[PDB]
Amino acid sequence: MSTPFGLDLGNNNSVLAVARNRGIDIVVNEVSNRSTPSVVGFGPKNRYLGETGKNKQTSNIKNTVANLKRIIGLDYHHPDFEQESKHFTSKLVELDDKKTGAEVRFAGEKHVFSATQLAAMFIDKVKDTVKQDTKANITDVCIAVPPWYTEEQRYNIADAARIAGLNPVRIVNDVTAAGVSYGIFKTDLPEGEEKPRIVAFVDIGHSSYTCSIMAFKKGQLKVLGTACDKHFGGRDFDLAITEHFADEFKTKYKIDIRENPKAYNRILTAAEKLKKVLSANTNAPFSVESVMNDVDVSSQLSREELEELVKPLLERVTEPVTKALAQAKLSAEEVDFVEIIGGTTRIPTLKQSISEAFGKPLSTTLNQDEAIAKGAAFICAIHSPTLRVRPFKFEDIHPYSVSYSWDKQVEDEDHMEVFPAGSSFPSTKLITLNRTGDFSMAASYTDITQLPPNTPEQIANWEITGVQLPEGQDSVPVKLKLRCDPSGLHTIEEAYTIEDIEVEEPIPLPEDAPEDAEQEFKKVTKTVKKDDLTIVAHTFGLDAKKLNELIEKENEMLAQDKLVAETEDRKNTLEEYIYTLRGKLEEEYAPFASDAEKTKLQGMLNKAEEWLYDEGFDSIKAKYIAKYEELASLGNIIRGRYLAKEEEK
Amino acid sequence: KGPAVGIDLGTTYSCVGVFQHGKVEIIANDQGNRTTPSYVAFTDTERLIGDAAKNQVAMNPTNTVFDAKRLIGRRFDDAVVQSDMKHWPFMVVNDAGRPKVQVEYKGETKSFYPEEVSSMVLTKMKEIAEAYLGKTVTNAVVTVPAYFNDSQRQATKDAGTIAGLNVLRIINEPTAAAIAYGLDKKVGAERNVLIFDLGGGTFDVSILTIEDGIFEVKSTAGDTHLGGEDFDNRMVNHFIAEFKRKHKKDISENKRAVRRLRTACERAKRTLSSSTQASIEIDSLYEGIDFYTSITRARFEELNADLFRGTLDPVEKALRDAKLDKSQIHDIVLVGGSTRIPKIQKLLQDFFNGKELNKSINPDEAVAYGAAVQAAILSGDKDLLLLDVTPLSLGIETAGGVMTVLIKRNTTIPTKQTQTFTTYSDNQPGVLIQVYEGERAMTKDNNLLGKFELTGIPPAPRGVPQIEVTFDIDANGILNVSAVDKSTGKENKITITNDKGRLSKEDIERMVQEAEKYKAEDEKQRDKVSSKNSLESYAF
Ligand SMILES: Nc1ncnc2c1ncn2[C@@H]1O[C@H](COP(=O)(O)OP(=O)(O)O)[C@@H](O)[C@H]1O
Ligand SMILES: Nc1ncnc2c1ncn2[C@@H]1O[C@H](COP(=O)(O)OP(=O)(O)O)[C@@H](O)[C@H]1O
Ligand code: BEF
Ligand SMILES: [Cl-]
Ligand SMILES: [Cl-]
């Protein structure tokens, strides 16, 4: 009896939702915000995870890691690494796997963490965020990612979930999670037998722009076309401006802010804040204290100037809308509504620039911050063994053609296209292979020139074991079950041998009644499962060994944090006990404590007071309950002869 | 096309909810904000409502109107309006007996009544509703504090209609909140309920009496200027202590540095309701200096010992004025974001002796919640999405090692099932109830979850006695299995110590299939035995 948790792992901030009390609620965190910041940062005694990490952004700038979701599966030498690190702040380094990772000063030492392991860190925090709000148990997770994520990164971010000890029931394309939101709430979608409603969804968030068009009917969405600009989000606007001011403070100030980390960074943060402000007002003041050489900066920006700045971005906007309709084999007037979600769709010029990209008004009927997450948790619920969900069918788009190959034994061919381009997923395909024995299979892209530069082409491979020939047979048909799963992942779900046998059945003839006699039987061949075969999968997923490894580090790092915080709890139970004791020696215990008894403490509180000011400002958990002990010795006693003496007396 | 929204017109921030899908949805504004500020700001070009207005305050302070709620439907020479005219950096004229606020809209002079300011706030709340909902919005339930008098209570319904709303009904803030938690739907008797509304700058205790869902407003106590913003102040003060000390510089003259130290304390405050420590780190606070410090929660609760504890006062003065004792309040309800302060709850709960506090619903917006429920009820209400169910067939063991199911797998939860059993041998003293989970027909392929005994059945002939097992699951999935003797009334039960943690839908589906692969020989095993009945504590 544990709760479905869907997580919307956005580049700037995540939104946690849970399915419960027959609906889907959002979970608020420790600082009462409805979205945690997707930041992992590292102290000298603990980790700063989620909400805390952001505070430290300016102190801990060097051991603060954000952009979590973009370094997942990022090849260290990728021709675009530039575009990602552009936005970083901690140093990124290559790993054994040629993949990207982070160097951070943490628990005294240098440490190096992989994007998978960093992402596992954040997910653990929010898992906890939800654990505490639910008071209940948390295991299954459905996570939302950009549709652009590769079959690799889908695996990685899933393995992340595993390190932070959640089992990933599904990796879902985010805007499709918003589609499920839409589908399961809106109330008079067309009937199955009617033409469906075509709704385009546009999500410009912190770093990624995505536009996908879907067809809805009661209980049903099918995704018709999706097209992304993964280098177009709020963060690109934040620079655009930050750069304009950088020029000014070269002029009427002459500091090249592009000379200081701490400086550039505080202007950035302030650019962001200003921008949000011009989404509601036409003019906005701008000022940062002591940028460099004890200099104070002061300027402003008008909406008109803001927009004038971003014309470059405002011109990359229609590109994916065209690409989307083009793929969905649709024309723009066939799209009934266009719903905007995503933080940076709040900028009015952008609102318009997309309206004129579809040539109709925008609609805003989803909660445009919680829809990807809310829908994601519904999906998680689907996979809940303890829930019966409203029936809802959704098929996403499977853009690239994928074939499967196999040991050409007795078979004419050793491969075939299995999941065509533009088909939906999930999809299961049954094949039957003729087998002289054990064999190997592999899945890969049919035309590697269709995929983004430097995409491997090989996707996964399996080995099938335990093939065993009937008796006198030279070969054996094994039925395989190739499956493109609900996370988009290309698998082989099940494989077994089959064999014919003869099942003697009786022949009727109850027409005549010929003295009751002449019962005939016919041998009948019945094809039947023979043996179940064994599949070892070799995928981008991590092996049980390296998994438990990554898991034991998250297990330690986590429990060093859980001590670091379990300690400062006592430092408080003490401190609180100190105040509440002096404050009752007068307000309740004066009539109830002795007089010589009062100078026993008073008193003893006072050493235990300034105690908390050097030894220890930060002592050890041992001593924070140590002092609490002997202070409580003198408590109770008094406190009690009071309580049993007024309670009944 | 035309639905029923519920609006909380509050002093500084208004909220707007709509009831769709069994629960209330709270609508966000086109800036992401669930609550919207009650500010209108006039300027030259055009006017500005909500965030737009509150953004450009301090660049129009003498033209950005607010707190119009503090004078809607009242007389210029009023007891409380006199005290009020003080802060508002805008002009408050008189147009024959009543108050009227006066401004620079388009450069010169114009003046609007309170109901007019408040009405152009609802207009935005209307708008905000209309955006999200798709169609247009006309019917609304608007809320007001229990202590409103018919004149201001009326001027509120005017704001409504001036704003093109069809104000279905005006209702109490305290009663809206009790609505949300649906106490006006709890089994008979007469109910006493205390709302404990601690905003960011207003406090309000109210005691209501409900019979048959009719709201009788017993008494109101409170404090006009008490909330969040106050506990903030203590911190700010306290930290200027610290900064002035640790640095010889005193910041108190810095309208920006004091602001930044303020923002930081509010954040820390919020942190301190969840953690026991918090941290303040303003890069370059004053004269290029960096302020980085911490603050403990006990230290926080200490700066406000006087303030917190003092919230207990309008409680006693409401408990009294309403002629009731502390133990006659059946339900307490936290409302407003300051009620999240562990200590304030700690104080309130103990005062009422460990009694539980209704606070599931974000207090930030409990009221708007209640109002959105009402506008439903008042408009005809304007399958199930999610259902809790059972993972595995539950049952007991029967003569043979058979599994006799009481609750079929995938049964809709809150459930009760009962099947009469009998005895296996004669003069059988007692039965052994063994509870099994699994989908196999033989308890040897299923999982034992627990066992207990019914003993002291009147000895009788093999087959007579009417033992009567019942499986009970509450909403939480707790399982009580109980056997009762029809004959005597002798009864024993057990509450299965659960274990859940766990099996995932795959696991079940693989379990379900094993049981389909053996249907044949499983079925032909209890299809050779014949009897549904339990054996004398003869386990196995
Ligand atoms: N009112 C607003 N106006 C303009 N931009 C905004 C507004 N609110 C948020 N944003 C921007 O949108 C981004 C966050 O949107 P979100 O979609 O949550 O990001 P992600 O989903 O990638 O985590 C931030 O960069 C923020 O600056
Ligand atoms: N977790 C929390 N702990 C303590 N105070 C909080 C918390 N969340 C919000 N607050 C405080 O509640 C105040 C506002 O809450 P609310 O009831 O909505 O009244 P308002 O209408 O003034 O916003 C703010 O001053 C804020 O500091
Ligand atoms: F998650 Be966001 F919408 F990119
Ligand atoms: Cl009662
Ligand atoms: Cl004060």
Ligand SMILES: [Cl-]
């Ligand atoms: Cl809450």
Ligand SMILES: [Mg+2]
């Ligand atoms: Mg994003």
Ligand SMILES: [Mg+2]
């Ligand atoms: Mg109020």
